[PDB]
Write an enzyme that holds these catalytic residues in place. Structure first.
Site, PDB file in Angstrom:
ATOM      1  N   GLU A 130       0.811  -1.187   0.000  1.00 16.82           N
ATOM      2  CA  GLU A 130       0.000   0.000   0.000  1.00 16.82           C
ATOM      3  C   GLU A 130       0.871   1.276   0.000  1.00 16.82           C
ATOM      4  OE1 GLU A 130      -3.136   0.740   3.202  1.00 16.82           O
ATOM      5  OE2 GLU A 130      -4.363   0.152   1.483  1.00 16.82           O
ATOM      6  N   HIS A 176       7.060 -27.098   0.496  1.00 14.47           N
ATOM      7  CA  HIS A 176       6.247 -28.081  -0.226  1.00 14.47           C
ATOM      8  C   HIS A 176       5.145 -27.443  -1.085  1.00 14.47           C
ATOM      9  CE1 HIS A 176       8.131 -31.266   2.332  1.00 14.47           C
ATOM     10  NE2 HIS A 176       8.304 -30.183   3.075  1.00 14.47           N
ATOM     11  N   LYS A 184     -14.447   1.858  -3.511  1.00 10.91           N
ATOM     12  CA  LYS A 184     -15.356   2.313  -2.459  1.00 10.91           C
ATOM     13  C   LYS A 184     -16.547   3.091  -3.015  1.00 10.91           C
ATOM     14  CE  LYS A 184     -11.729   2.729   0.942  1.00 10.91           C
ATOM     15  NZ  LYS A 184     -11.068   3.641   1.882  1.00 10.91           N
TER      16      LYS A 184
END
Ligand SMILES: [Cl-]
Ligand SMILES: [Cl-]
Ligand SMILES: [Cl-]
Ligand SMILES: [Cl-]
Lengths: 450, 450, 449, 450
Positions: free
Chosen positions: B283, B312, B424
């Site tokens: 960010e 793995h 938003k």
């Protein structure tokens, strides 16, 4: 009321994104994709066969398993993540903290897929060995981590005077390896990792199904979903074949500089599905040499995200940083507990009052997806009507096939993992293991701040 | 017995890796790095000041907090991940499942940092509202997710006839926003998000410290570690300055095609430290426009890994795929529960017999790091002598400073997040919020498989 | 705080026909007086009650509150004392009470055998995280204690618990394997005093630790032992219970009483009787005397419980061979005085609204009288209640008495050479380095399968 | 699966012990022993008949008994020790402290076989009267200790308003005595003490079977073992007849000055089997008068020992004190919880590492036995392959037969107990019981220290 997953690849294409894939792009690879599907149909990998014995051998143990209130899976990677993916996606998040009555008689499932003693100790503190089954899972029969955790569990059973054969179930290759020898010499119950199925492709084999059945997941419905998915994945019509489409579009984008696949699941219960995809994509397609032996260093890094959470972590970067990512959203539209947001009486919160909390979550996914489109970041969406075994079995099958197809397209072997062997050799040497001799040299340049 | 974190940057440099950074490379950026340090010293961001009021305002509530057996943090991103990072790294993994006696009287901490009703419902099923405190945390005072979860918690308190002022603590800007108005109008206890400190830099402010103190973490020692780290981060000698070195080396590598930072923690309790780093790096540094207003689309994607587990999953790709990653290992050398692997009597397992399980984990980190070096994949290592508040406070401070320095080097603003605002706006419009009018257009190309 | 009362009357003529006489007493009085004088002048270490025994245990009080359970890994001298204290000085359901009912004090379990049904059942009842293992061995290498130590330690290790936080070692201060472990690994520890043998060690840190853990007043225990040892140093034999116990038992041993029966009228006193069994048997059961002459001396101690064994052994004690001296332990006041209800039935009127203990006590009195009438010699030790003061008196009086019997019998009452052969055979069976005993194939095999 | 107890009488005989029994010794009594066996076969005592109604009458109450979670036996001696012997030997030692689920639904069993208020009060503190059955057992129907504890149980039931007939089961003579009257007048459920079976021979009658069945012991299997043992006890070949051999050898030794029988069980679970034996041998064989009315004062004092524990208490005396003992070991070769001793890493403990803890117990029995042989102390061994009802039934049967045979050899009545009556008379007089007038006289000689 079983429904296919819905796929929406629209935001991967021009004109939806400027920079998008084109009809020319699709035509450039269509034949090679059809051939990947044909090859899958003609030389089907063992994982896609969904042998009836995988379910039957597990159901044969069902009467015995109801002796236990907990199953602890001692397994790692291919032998551990599929267990966690099934457990999270198909039971409530507080399952292990529910009473037995709340669990309707089915078992708690803990997976110990690391050699961190804080992990093992925290699981040991939660279990009664007298009512616990350890499922020791290793294809090779000698994975170091699994040996270590097997040793600890065995040691505790012994010290308490519990018969290991009454508390351990071994899942390993039918013929080779140390764990199979233990089975044969000491008479443990056992299940098989199918010889032609690699760890990361083993979730729908007894590796995944035993713990799933233990906790009351409908394993038949899981295979029913996978079966239907595999059937659609054998369609030579690519516009009816979700797995072919995933491979087609990711192959093209890898070629155009999209070095990262982001899978962003709008559900906390789906998060281990993403981790399972992470291993599947990274370990399958991340290859030094192609099938001809040519150095290609291929791969597409899989990144795990959680919506809406990671809108407050990674969405700045996904919209404004390098354009190196293809983003797949996982969207589930119905939840087992639909919380309704109360009316607080505050005018500021009227947009939330008496809506389902999931309505907000779903609005956030839609808005996040649209913002990404508007910023020409390629994205697609897989929509589940709910978290059901049918839908999760589809998910596994579609991505196992898609990964198979990407290995064809990239002309690599998607079923091996040579790059892991060096670290193991060094580690065993560090652990003093007989016949392991690697010596780490003293470094010329040491840049330390201590 | 408080020790500095040790940093080993050796495998970032030539000749340790072929392709490594050189003395020429360091010289190319040394001045710009020293200037970043000088700028930090001369125009210190508020986060690095560690105001005494941050601890004092939280300790002032300590007598009140011991009324509660659980604290639920209703916060997201900057207001949620630091809480989880402290909780995981500094308490046992089964803390919330321990009895109150085992917790020595301190509280359970649950964080609800998503609007997934499966998450909220699972936390609600674990708590007694009569003995729970909800810490509602939003800097802006109006984060949608936090409003939604606040509404649910408030609604439950109301329906049960519990006084919200006895069960909610509000942490928000001292002057602006809806939550501050609620505080003023209804008389809630409150704490402040400091005006000059952004969410992702707020963990050591009352945002993080309240829940930490609730669960019995030594918050003074946390600041002591951060203080010492910040002091070393102000050293203009770059070879004594771990934060400057992280920035220097990552800046150079970003320039040389290393588009991914992998932070791989060899501890399950450190995993949320990595998620906190993820938001901090992504960010901060993932920015469209530079400080001049020029389009740069900068950033380095942070990837979370867990050792030995992800050996793995991702180690094939890290060793054999594209060389686009700088890998930072987090290594902890002492564990709170040191399990010893028992002797099983099997010759095959002699290399494990009676060694600490952590010895294996540490051997795996060392071997994984060496294999990566041998494959010329650049890596460094941060070593903790244990999981202590001192060491975790250092960790946060060093990375907050390093991120600050990378924003200087990249000549961007590392303290804003403009790319989040579009999603938003679309979401609020979808939610019918007054004054939000964005309409998603019907698409020309629809590529769906349904 | 009142003295134990002793009533030796049914050991003497005319109370029993065949009883001891004044002539009998005069025959040994001088030898007894010399026993007492030797005790006074060359006092054995057990009788000194060193302050450091209590002080070293009390130093751990703050640390012990971390635990809800203490498990004693000890056997014989390092185990029976702990059980005698536990049973006699806490209610029988102590380990099954809640922590609140125990007022915060710990549960006490003793693992004094290598039966895995014993260890397993104790392990099934404990949380290692809140358990302290007190590993007790004077020698530092007692096989049974090494075996249980190994199990406890392995469990601690597998769970990642630091053994130093969950084990306390009680052993010789200088010699032996456990002492070495303490010095190499930094365990907390207590001492078995060098000059105190296992069977004489209950009032040392061996017994005091687990007693303190469970909330017994160990100061009061020593206070009673101190008072008893003082009376045991009186040269007036008629004021000296220990001297009278040795006097009378020595005379009877010589008159064919080859068995001592200690019959306790309390289920809580049963392990006091077992402690006595080891004390009398291992001390006085000796092949050779102090001159090296073969004597095969001994008086077999037999454990009985009243009123229970009235329905098991009382037929034999009254009608069989007259080879027993019977000591009764009588407690007169109980912590829970149950009153027998009125049932309304005429047949039960003799029981109605009496204390249950009144029946118990009437039964002791009747059993004792019937044995006297049948000329079976008996005495009685009466406790006013089960208190630390009284129990400390009991241990002291009997330790002194055993010392005196060894003097009278002219044997060493402080060694145990007869135990070594079985251990050597066992270690050889267990493949222990340097143990080579081979059990020969038998000529005569008489088997039924 | 079902195996006969194995008997080894070898260390009772010359040359195995110097001073041992000889073939002449065997000849001396063979005919009288054969005659004992013949009398048993031709005038079989009621205890050896194992009537089907003893099991059937108890099994007919099984549906009723599952209402209860706890059975409390109020009985003493013959009506109490058998219950304890069966409880300890055939259920784990923590049975009463296991949860109901751990007990598989079966009841906890407490035996109150004393009038010590600390015993009764400790049992009462552990039971809930609403879920408790009191089995009141007295052959005579008036045993004072049982009347007193009956009175207490009944008063509690009354004061709580519970119907005594729902919480009490009376086991007594079918026709005579106060308890039988109570049954007839008040309508209690009841079972019979068989009129021709004395208390000390009653374990395999409903006296013992009821509580055993309540806690889940297979009482059929108990009888099956007793039946096989009683059959072998009727064999006139003394070398195939364990009970005959026990009686032969112990009779011979009693005549050679072995005044003490030591039964030393190498199992904490078998300790009450030893107590049961104590009452059997002592009360049967300890007789003033023989069958002719001649004063014999006969008897062999039975002594209880526990291995390995009593190696540290009594083994010094057994090896080096008077040679007045015949020692029988009870050896069990397989345990329900087989603890393995861990490897500690210490060279001093290599002889224990990874052996079963029971290997050490068994080695200790063997060594103890051999040392006693070497010291010419006569001993035999009874070996159980496990603690099973078949093996325990065999034990009771063989010893009940052996005792019958001893009484024949000694020419006494083994089935009466006239020596207990005097003490009862005195006690009843002290208790002010109508018609009991014994007065204890003031003594001439009082020798007291106060
Ligand atoms: Cl990631
Ligand atoms: Cl301390
Ligand atoms: Cl009936
Ligand atoms: Cl005895």
């Amino acid at each position: 009321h079983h429904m296919s997953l819905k796929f929406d690849f629209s935001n991967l294409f021009e004109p939806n994104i400027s920079g998008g894939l084109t009809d020319e792009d699709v035509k450039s690879v269509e034949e090679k994709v059809t051939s990947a599907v044909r090859n899958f149909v003609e030389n089907t990998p063992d994982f896609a066969k969904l042998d009836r014995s995988w379910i039957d051998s597990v159901k044969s143990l069902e009467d015995w398993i109801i002796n236990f209130d907990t199953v602890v899976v001692l397994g790692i990677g291919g032998s551990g993540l599929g267990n966690l993916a099934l457990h999270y996606s198909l039971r409530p998040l507080n399952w292990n903290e529910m009473t037995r009555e709340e669990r309707n008689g089915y078992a708690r499932v803990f997976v110990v897929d690391n050699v961190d003693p804080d992990l093992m100790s925290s699981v040991l503190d939660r279990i009664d060995p007298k009512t616990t089954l350890f499922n020791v899972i290793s294809k090779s029969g000698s994975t170091a981590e699994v040996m270590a955790t097997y040793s600890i569990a065995r040691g505790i059973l012994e010290a308490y005077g519990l018969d290991p054969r009454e508390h351990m179930l071994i899942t390993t290759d039918p013929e080779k390896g140390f764990l199979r020898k233990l089975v044969k010499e000491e008479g443990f119950r056992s299940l098989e990792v199918p010889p032609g199925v690699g760890g990361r492709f083993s979730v729908l084999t007894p590796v995944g199904l035993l713990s799933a059945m233990a906790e009351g997941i409908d394993i038949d419905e899981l295979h029913e979903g996978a079966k239907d998915a595999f059937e659609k994945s054998m369609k030579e019509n690519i516009l009816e074949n979700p797995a072919a489409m995933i491979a087609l579009t990711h192959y093209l984008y890898l070629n155009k500089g999209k070095s990262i696949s982001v899978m962003m699941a709008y559900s906390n219960r789906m998060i281990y599905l993403v981790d399972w995809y992470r291993q599947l994509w990274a370990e399958s397609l991340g290859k030094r040499y192609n099938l001809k032996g040519e150095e290609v260093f291929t791969g597409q890094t899989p990144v795990k995200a959680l919506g809406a959470t990671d809108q407050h972590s990674q969405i700045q970067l996904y919209n404004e940083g390098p354009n190196d990512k293809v983003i797949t959203f996982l969207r589930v539209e119905n939840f087992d507990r639909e919380i309704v947001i109360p009316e607080t009486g505050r005018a500021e919160l009227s947009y939330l009052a008496r809506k389902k909390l999931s309505e907000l979550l779903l609005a956030e996914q839609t808005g996040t997806e649209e913002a990404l489109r508007e910023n020409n970041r390629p994205n697609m969406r897989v929509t589940f009507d709910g978290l059901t075994p049918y839908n999760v079995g589809q998910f596994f099958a579609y991505y196992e096939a898609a990964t198979a197809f990407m290995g064809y397209l990239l002309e690599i072997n998607p079923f091996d993992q040579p790059g892991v062997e060096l670290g193991k050799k060094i580690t065993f040497a560090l652990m003093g293991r007989e016949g392991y001799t690697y010596e780490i040299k003293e470094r010329s340049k040491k840049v330390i701040i201590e």
